Amino acid sequence: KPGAMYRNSSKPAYTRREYISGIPGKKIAQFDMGNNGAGPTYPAQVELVVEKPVQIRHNALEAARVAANRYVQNSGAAANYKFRIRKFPFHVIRENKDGMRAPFGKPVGTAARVHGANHIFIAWVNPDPNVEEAWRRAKMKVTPTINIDSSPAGNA
Amino acid sequence: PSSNGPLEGTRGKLKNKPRDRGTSPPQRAVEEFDDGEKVHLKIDPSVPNGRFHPRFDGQTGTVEGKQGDAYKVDIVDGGKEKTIIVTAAHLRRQE
Amino acid sequence: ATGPRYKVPMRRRREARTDYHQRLRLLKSGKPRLVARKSNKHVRAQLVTLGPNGDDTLASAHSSDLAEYGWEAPTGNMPSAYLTGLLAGLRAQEAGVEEAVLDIGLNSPTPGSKVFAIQEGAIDAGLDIPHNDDVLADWQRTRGAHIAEYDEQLEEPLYSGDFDAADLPEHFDELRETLLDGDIEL
Amino acid sequence: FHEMREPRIEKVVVHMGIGHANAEDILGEITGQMPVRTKAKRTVGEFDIREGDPIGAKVTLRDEMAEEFLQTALPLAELATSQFDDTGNFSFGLDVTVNLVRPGYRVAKRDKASRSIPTKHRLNPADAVAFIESTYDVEV
Amino acid sequence: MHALVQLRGEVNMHTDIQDTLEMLNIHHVNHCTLVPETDAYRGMVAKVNDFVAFGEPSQETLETVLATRAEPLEGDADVDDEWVAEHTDYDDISGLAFALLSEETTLREQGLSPTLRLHPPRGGHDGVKHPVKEGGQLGKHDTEGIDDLLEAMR
RNA sequence: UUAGGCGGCCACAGCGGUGGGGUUGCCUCCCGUACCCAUCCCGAACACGGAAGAUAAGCCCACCAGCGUUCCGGGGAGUACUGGAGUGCGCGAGCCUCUGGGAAACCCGGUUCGCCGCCACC
RNA sequence: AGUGCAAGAGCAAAAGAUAGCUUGACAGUGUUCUUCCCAACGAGGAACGCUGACGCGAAAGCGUGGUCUAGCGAACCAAUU
RNA sequence: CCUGUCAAACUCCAAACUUACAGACGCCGUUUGACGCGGGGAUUCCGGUGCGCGGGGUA
Numbered sequence: 005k006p007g008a009m010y011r012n013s014s015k016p017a018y019t020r021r022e023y024i025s026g027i028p029g030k031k032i033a034q035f036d037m038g039n040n041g042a043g044p045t046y047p048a049q050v051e052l053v054v055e056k057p058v059q060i061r062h063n064a065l066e067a068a069r070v071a072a073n074r075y076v077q078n079s080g081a082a083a084n085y086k087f088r089i090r091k092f093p094f095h096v097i098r099e100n101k102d103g104m105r106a107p108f109g110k111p112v113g114t115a116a117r118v119h120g121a122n123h124i125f126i127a128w129v130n131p132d133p134n135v136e137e138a139w140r141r142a143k144m145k146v147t148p149t150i151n152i153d154s155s156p157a158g159n160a
Numbered sequence: 161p162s163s164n165g166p167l168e169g170t171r172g173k174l175k176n177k178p179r180d181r182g183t184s185p186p187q188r189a190v191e192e193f194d195d196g197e198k199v200h201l202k203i204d205p206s207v208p209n210g211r212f213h214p215r216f217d218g219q220t221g222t223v224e225g226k227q228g229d230a231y232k233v234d235i236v237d238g239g240k241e242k243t244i245i246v247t248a249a250h251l252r253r254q255e
Numbered sequence: 256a257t258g259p260r261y262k263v264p265m266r267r268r269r270e271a272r273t274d275y276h277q278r279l280r281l282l283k284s285g286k287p288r289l290v291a292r293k294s295n296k297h298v299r300a301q302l303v304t305l306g307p308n309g310d311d312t313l314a315s316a317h318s319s320d321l322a323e324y325g326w327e328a329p330t331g332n333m334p335s336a337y338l339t340g341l342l343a344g345l346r347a348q349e350a351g352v353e354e355a356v357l358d359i360g361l362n363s364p365t366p367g368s369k370v371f372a373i374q375e376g377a378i379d380a381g382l383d384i385p386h387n388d389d390v391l392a393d394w395q396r397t398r399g400a401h402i403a404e405y406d407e408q409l410e411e412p413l414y415s416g417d418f419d420a421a422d423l424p425e426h427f428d429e430l431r432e433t434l435l436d437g438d439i440e441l
Numbered sequence: 442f443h444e445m446r447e448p449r450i451e452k453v454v455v456h457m458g459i460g461h462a463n464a465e466d467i468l469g470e471i472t473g474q475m476p477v478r479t480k481a482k483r484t485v486g487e488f489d490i491r492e493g494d495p496i497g498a499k500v501t502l503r504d505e506m507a508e509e510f511l512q513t514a515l516p517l518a519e520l521a522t523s524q525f526d527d528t529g530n531f532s533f534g535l536d537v538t539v540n541l542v543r544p545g546y547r548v549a550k551r552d553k554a555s556r557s558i559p560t561k562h563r564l565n566p567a568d569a570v571a572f573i574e575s576t577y578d579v580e581v
Numbered sequence: 582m583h584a585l586v587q588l589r590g591e592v593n594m595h596t597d598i599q600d601t602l603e604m605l606n607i608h609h610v611n612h613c614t615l616v617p618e619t620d621a622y623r624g625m626v627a628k629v630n631d632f633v634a635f636g637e638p639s640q641e642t643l644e645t646v647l648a649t650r651a652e653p654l655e656g657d658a659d660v661d662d663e664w665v666a667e668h669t670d671y672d673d674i675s676g677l678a679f680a681l682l683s684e685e686t687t688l689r690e691q692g693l694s695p696t697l698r699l700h701p702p703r704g705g706h707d708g709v710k711h712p713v714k715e716g717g718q719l720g721k722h723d724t725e726g727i728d729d730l731l732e733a734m735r
Numbered sequence: 736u737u738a739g740g741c742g743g744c745c746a747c748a749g750c751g752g753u754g755g756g757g758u759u760g761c762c763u764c765c766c767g768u769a770c771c772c773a774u775c776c777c778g779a780a781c782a783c784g785g786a787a788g789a790u791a792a793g794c795c796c797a798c799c800a801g802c803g804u805u806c807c808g809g810g811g812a813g814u815a816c817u818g819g820a821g822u823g824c825g826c827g828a829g830c831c832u833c834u835g836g837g838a839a840a841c842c843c844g845g846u847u848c849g850c851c852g853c854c855a856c857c
Numbered sequence: 858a859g860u861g862c863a864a865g866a867g868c869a870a871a872a873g874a875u876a877g878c879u880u881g882a883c884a885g886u887g888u889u890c891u892u893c894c895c896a897a898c899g900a901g902g903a904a905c906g907c908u909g910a911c912g913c914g915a916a917a918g919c920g921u922g923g924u925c926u927a928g929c930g931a932a933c934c935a936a937u938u
Numbered sequence: 939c940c941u942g943u944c945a946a947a948c949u950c951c952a953a954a955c956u957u958a959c960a961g962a963c964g965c966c967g968u969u970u971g972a973c974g975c976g977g978g979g980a981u982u983c984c985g986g987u988g989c990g991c992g993g994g995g996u997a
């Protein structure tokens with residue numbers, strides 16, 4: 005199914021599991037990557053900034069995250085960096101799969117609502133931004149256009 | 161609405177903020193009002209009797225006699241005139 | 256105390272002084288209230304009415320200013336209470352007050368108790384109070400007779416020095432007698 | 442200061458937690474006054490489903506009645522320490538509990554203007570051991 | 582005291598806005614009225630902020646407009662100096678003008694129609710799709726700004 | 736108000752903590768059960784009667800801000816959101832300008848350890 | 858926590874718990890709101906009185922069934938007081 | 939302790955706004971009689987579109 009069907013924040017928030025059942029599991033494997041044993045004690049901190057509010061299916065989250073982290077292996081499986089995807093797919097999504105009669109759909113997924121300008125990913129790295137590249141690949145698999153932002157890093 | 165009971169859609173208006181919880185001071189349940197005096201209606205979540213229909217919450221009537229210990233307040237609903245049986249616990253002097 | 260959502264009783268319930276539920280029921284009569292209060296040593300009686308910023312005491316009597324009329328005996332007893340009742344009552348009357356309801360604070364409605372005694376006295380003083388004769392003491396116990404008899408089992412005076420050895424319920428009469436005519440502050 | 446700060450016994454509760462009695466008789470003699478029934482709460486497997494139901498008795502002794510009982514109770518016990526309350530109480534044994542406190546306790550037990558006893562004025566395990574130990578026996 | 586001029590027509594304009602224009606005596610496009618600067622009136626002009634043009638006019642321009650478009654509560658009569666003196670408390674247009682501005686009186690109080698029915702702006706106004714701050718002709722104006730518009734519609 | 740009784744507002748008053756106070760006006764703890772009255776068992780409580788002792792509780796007074804709460808300064812923020820207007824922008828979702836309103840979290844600094852009424856009283 | 862049952866709402870010297878007593882879950886007739894916002898419409902439902910008779914309490918007072926919002930049925934005909 | 943997120947059927951907060959009543963200005967009414975009352979006669983109970991706010995639905 006296409007992103008076109010759920011990418012807008014036009015329906016009400018629908019996240020109360022106490023009133024919803026049959027919610028598919030999220031495909032997102034991890035939110036903390038790299039050296040999670042260490043704390044953000046890094047010189048350089050870049051972030052992937054979303055540029056338009058949208059919804060992002062757990063599908064796109066996992067694909068955007070794998071694609072970046074699986075690449076951050078330009079640094080090694082046990083490399084010095086920590087990656088973080090800060091959004092979770094709270095927003096439950098339906099589909100009406102009778103025509104338009106009794107159409108309130110059936111839960112088919114979850115998606116996270118990202119406002120334009122929120123950072124969806126944050127990576128910590130020593131002056132060794134291969135991360136800038138891990139993100140060209142990641143915003144490739146999410147709906148929006150993105151801005152790759154660096155914060156602590158005037159080592160230009 | 162899915163139902164048409166009196167308390168339909170009264171969750172907020174008939175519920176106290178946590179700190180205003182519990183029996184209320186009597187001083188106001190005993191308040192005396194003269195015929196002609198303007199009084200704002202509002203239900204006290206703590207007080208179960210001497211109540212009026214939730215819809216009137218917010219009205220400012222004109223006390224006009226009483227029935228029992230209860231007051232008779234005359235109000236205008238939309239364009240309709242109405243007499244409401246309510247206790248001092250749920251009223252307040254205007255101004 | 257604990258948080259933003261925590262509920263703190265009203266001051267006078269914190270202090271365990273005012274039973275608000277009993278206070279409502281009392282106020283319903285719309286009459287004044289005969290506040291019947293005790294102390295280890297004294298007994299107080301107020302005739303309170305309702306006001307905009309709090310109660311108004313129009314008439315009162317303390318077992319202490321009883322002596323001011325010739326009381327030479329203890330003041331935390333039956334006869335003591337009655338007379339205080341009657342004394343408050345009379346000042347009450349003088350006040351232009353005609354009726355009231357007995358508020359007994361957190362005390363218990365035990366029969367022939369001092370509060371009822373206070374009640375009996377204010378009634379006799381001319382005050383019209385809702386009551387029940389057979390919950391009051393038998394006059395004799397109001398006179399302090401129970402005490403005179405207690406001192407009969409003497410061997411040692413009931414009163415340390417005080418007045419008398421065998422005590423005086425007669426002293427009682429002399430005083431009620433005195434209160435029932437003329438005199439100052441009545 | 443002292444005198445009004447020195448410990449004292451306030452009730453000694455002797456109760457027999459049976460599971461369904463004839464035991465009252467013995468409590469009555471061992472103490473000197475009528476026992477009281479012990480109903481239970483909650484329905485449970487030990488064929489104890491009955492809510493209101495006699496399941497043991499107790500006796501609350503005060504003043505002399507208490508001493509005159511302890512004056513034989515205590516001797517039958519050895520224990521001390523750890524087995525004491527954080528409020529200076531202790532239970533040993535058929536149970537025999539000893540509630541201990543200082544002079545102004547009525548403040549917290551009366552009806553009018555009642556109030557809880559400040560932590561300072563409360564009796565400590567230590568101050569408790571002392572009081573009793575100093576009355577016919579030894580601690581630990 | 583502000584000079585009000587209705588610049589947009591009634592079709593489609595909220596009813597409560599229209600009504601307000603109505604209680605300010607203006608019932609047609611290009612109609613003008615003079616209104617005291619009070620809390621109650623201010624609320625009204627604000628409400629109407631988007632279909633009108635308002636601001637404090639210069640003694641002079643008020644005089645021009647008064648003379649040219651002031652009318653008696655009834656009839657054709659020209660409000661000229663004479664009329665003003667032989668009918669009002671003042672001696673001449675100018676004295677009427679000064680009293681309006683200083684909010685010491687009102688057109689009605691002096692026997693005049695509260696409405697100065699102006700004429701379409703000679704040369705056209707700055708547009709009714711943008712406020713002044715945007716190059717259009719709606720909203721509050723400079724005393725220099727109001728004058729130009731009043732004057733254009735003299 | 737050198738200690739009281741009834742309250743109103745019902746935390747600005749809650750929680751915690753320190754200091755001070757009583758041959759007496761007092762309030763208490765306190766002492767004590769023949770009585771009225773009392774415990775499904777206990778004068779614990781309630782109720783009655785009383786002063787040998789005490790200021791240790793309570794209570795009243797003076798104070799502390801660590802928590803909770805109230806209000807205020809400055810910052811966040813004229814941000815978020817919004818009533819009215821637009822032939823302004825955007826493929827669109829949506830944004831912007833003009834006009835009238837205007838927040839929440841949080842941080843830093845103050846405030847708050849009740850205020851008021853009637854009565855009684857060296 | 859508990860308060861019979863949905864969900865939401867009330868309740869702490871109680872609206873909950875225990876004990877004891879008691880049958881107001883009473884007859885009669887009304888006022889008002891609701892049913893049906895506004896704005897007509899019946900049954901039903903509720904709030905608040907009065908008259909009469911009672912219950913419990915020292916008493917103020919509380920009891921017009923269950924803390925509140927669901928648990929309801931016209932004419933004709935029958936039976937019943 | 940530190941750290942990462944949410945809510946139509948969550949709320950320690952909390953607008954704009956909508957609303958009851960009153961006063962003020964405004965406008966209106968007292969020969970154009972308002973507000974209101976009583977009565978005759980209807981039509982009408984397929985609506986649609988723009989904008990703002992929506993709920994459903996890929997649309």
Ligand SMILES: [Cl-]
Pocket residue numbers: 291292293294360361362
């Ligand atoms: Cl008392």
Ligand SMILES: [Cl-]
Pocket residue numbers: 211212213244245890
């Ligand atoms: Cl009603």
Ligand SMILES: [Mg+2]
Pocket residue numbers: 172
């Ligand atoms: Mg709502």
Ligand SMILES: [Mg+2]
Pocket residue numbers: 652653654655656694
């Ligand atoms: Mg004319």
Ligand SMILES: [Mg+2]
Pocket residue numbers: 704
């Ligand atoms: Mg031209």
Ligand SMILES: [Mg+2]
Pocket residue numbers: 706707708709
């Ligand atoms: Mg143009």
Ligand SMILES: [Mg+2]
Pocket residue numbers: none
């Ligand atoms: Mg001290």
Ligand SMILES: [Mg+2]
Pocket residue numbers: none
């Ligand atoms: Mg009921």
Ligand SMILES: [Mg+2]
Pocket residue numbers: 936937
């Ligand atoms: Mg039948």
Ligand SMILES: [Mg+2]
Pocket residue numbers: 956
């Ligand atoms: Mg609304």
Ligand code: NA
Pocket residue numbers: 102105
């Ligand atoms: Na079908």
Ligand code: NA
Pocket residue numbers: 143144145146147148149150
């Ligand atoms: Na993209």
Ligand code: NA
Pocket residue numbers: 176180181182183184206
């Ligand atoms: Na309350």
Ligand code: NA
Pocket residue numbers: 478775
């Ligand atoms: Na029994």
Ligand code: NA
Pocket residue numbers: 790
């Ligand atoms: Na003390």
Ligand code: NA
Pocket residue numbers: none
């Ligand atoms: Na009906």
